[PDB]
Amino acid sequence: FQGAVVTVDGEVYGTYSLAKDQTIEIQDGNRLRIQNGQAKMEWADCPDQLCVHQKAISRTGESIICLPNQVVVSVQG
Amino acid sequence: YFQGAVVTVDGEVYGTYSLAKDQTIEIQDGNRLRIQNGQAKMEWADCPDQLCVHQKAISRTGESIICLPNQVVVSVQG
Ligand SMILES: [Zn+2]
Ligand SMILES: [Zn+2]
Numbered sequence: 001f002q003g004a005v006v007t008v009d010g011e012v013y014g015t016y017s018l019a020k021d022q023t024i025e026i027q028d029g030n031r032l033r034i035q036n037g038q039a040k041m042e043w044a045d046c047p048d049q050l051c052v053h054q055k056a057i058s059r060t061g062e063s064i065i066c067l068p069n070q071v072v073v074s075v076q077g
Numbered sequence: 078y079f080q081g082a083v084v085t086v087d088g089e090v091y092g093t094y095s096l097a098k099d100q101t102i103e104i105q106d107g108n109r110l111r112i113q114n115g116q117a118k119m120e121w122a123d124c125p126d127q128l129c130v131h132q133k134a135i136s137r138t139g140e141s142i143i144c145l146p147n148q149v150v151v152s153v154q155g
Pocket of ligand 2: 122124126127128129130143144145146147
């Protein structure tokens with residue numbers, strides 16, 4: 001399956017299918033929304049809010065990162 | 078203040094490299110980043126999937142290139 005791989009401090013947190021609408025609360029500091037086959041950072045407690053402003057991802061290799069919270073979201077097949 | 082490519086390996090910041098200067102960053106033995114014409118691109122990697130090498134060049138704040146097998150994160154900050 002094609003999913004959004006989430007790593008926190010370099011450790012794989014989980015892999016979430018893009019084909020299923022879901023909301024992932026990543027260790028209280030980030031919230032990922034999977035909707036219509038795309039992953040987007042819906043909310044974050046980081047000061048810069050850069051992760052929240054990155055465009056939704058759906059293609060293999062694409063990523064969303066929250067550097068202050070060491071969160072990496074990546075699309076893997 | 079400058080626009081640069083922040084490189085993290087295993088969550089540790091290695092450095093920030095100005096996008097305004099053409100340079101090659103050899104990130105340990107597994108990844109090589111090329112800064113050229115104000116853009117950062119993964120030129121080479123020893124990873125099996127080669128996904129980082131196929132990612133589009135980045136130049137805008139927040140944009141990223143990641144090599145998941147080698148725990149390399151490249152991000153534009155500033
Ligand atoms: Zn963030
Ligand atoms: Zn790679």
